[PDB]
Amino acid sequence: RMSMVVSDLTPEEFMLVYKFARKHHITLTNLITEETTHVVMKTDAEFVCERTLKYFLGIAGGKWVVSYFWVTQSIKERKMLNEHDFEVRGDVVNGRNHQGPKRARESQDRKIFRGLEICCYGPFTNMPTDQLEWMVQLCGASVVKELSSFTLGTGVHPIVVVQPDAWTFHAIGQMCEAPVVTREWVLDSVALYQCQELDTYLIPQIP
Ligand code: NI
């Protein structure tokens, strides 16, 4: 019914969430999964958080992405308050007021990567490749493991994703017929539950 993970909390803070879980009989786990229903984020007073992997995967799977104030207020009032009333409005990176968690929360039909084939290509830091893959797949993309495995034809849209920053890559276009973009395309996209124009993120390709 209800199952939670937390992100960006101190053990103290995590204690409080546990106490909360025990009281109301909510499930509490270390990892985010299919079933995870809530993601409790540390925010500032205006519900702005760091963007963590759990933050990303919460949005991606249209979860309840709620401020830690949901917890503390609910304890203060010996009652579970409105998940509605505490949602994260943004993150450092994507601005303090974009409201993507709620976007995603409802838009579970109009999924931002509906109709996409994505190949997370090469090496990534600060994020397991398979978690990035899960993420885009949660957003209605089809994952592809090899540049040479893209489905040819049309009406379909392949996309190569890379992290140039972690790039020890302008020559990928030589090996396929797809746009090449940064991981930031995906991450900004997911954070806003809004599919971004590649323009910004495109990596230029050698003939
Ligand atoms: Ni098209």
Ligand 1 geometric centre to CA of 27 (Å): 42
43 and 137 together in one domain: no
Statement to judge: residues 174 and 103 lie in one domain = no
Resolution of the solved structure (Å): 2.5
Separation of 155 CA from ligand 1 center, angstroms?
6
- CATH at 114: 3.40.50.10190
User: How many folded domains does the chain comprise?
Assistant: 2
Answer whether 191's CB lies under 8 Å from 100's CB: yes
Among 55, 77, 107, residue at a domain's last position:
107
C-alpha 108 to ligand 1 mean position (Å) = 21
Q: Are 69 and 27 in contact (CB under 8 A)?
A: no
Half-sphere exposure of 114 (CA within 13 A, CB side): 8
Q: Give the method of determination.
A: X-ray
Residue type, 37: T
Tokens of 7: 């992100």
Amino acid in the structure at residue 57: L
How far is 173 from 206, CA to CA, in rounded Å?
7
For residue 132, the CA-to-ligand 1 centroid distance in Å is 23
Is the same domain home to 98 and 126? no
Are the beta carbons of 55 and 91 closer than 8 angstroms? yes
Q: Which pair of structure tokens corresponds to residue 12?
A: 């103290």
End-to-end, the C-alpha distance of the chain in Å comes to: 53
Q: Do residues 94 and 141 both lie within one domain?
A: no
- The tokens for 152 are 């040819």
Which residue in 130, 141, 124, 115 sits closest to 183, CA to CA?
Answer: 124
Q: How far apart are CA 117 and CA 131, in angstroms?
A: 16
Q: Judging by DSSP bridges, how do beta strands 27-28 and 38-41 pair with one another? A: unpaired
Q: Label residues 171-207 b or e (16+ Cβ within 10 Å = b).
A: ebbeebebbbbbbbbbbbbbbbbebbeeeebebebee
Q: Which of 163, 156, 193, 196 is nearest to 178 (CA)?
A: 156
Q: Could you write out the DSSP letters of every residue in the chain?
A: --EEEEES--HHHHHHHHHHHHHHT-EE-SS--SS--EEEE-B-TTSEE---HHHHHHHHTT-EEEETHHHHHHHHTTS---GGGGB--EETTTBS---HHHHHHH-SSS-TTTTEEEEE-S--SSS-HHHHHHHHHHTTEEE-SSGGGS--SSSSEEEEEE-GGG-----GGGT-SS-EEEHHHHHHHHHTTS---GGGTPPP---
Distance CA 40, CA 14 (A): 10
Contact 189, 169 (CB under 8 A): no
Same domain, 70 and 114: no
Output the CA 157–ligand 1 centroid distance in Å: 7
Number of Cβ atoms within 10 Å of the Cβ of 119? 25
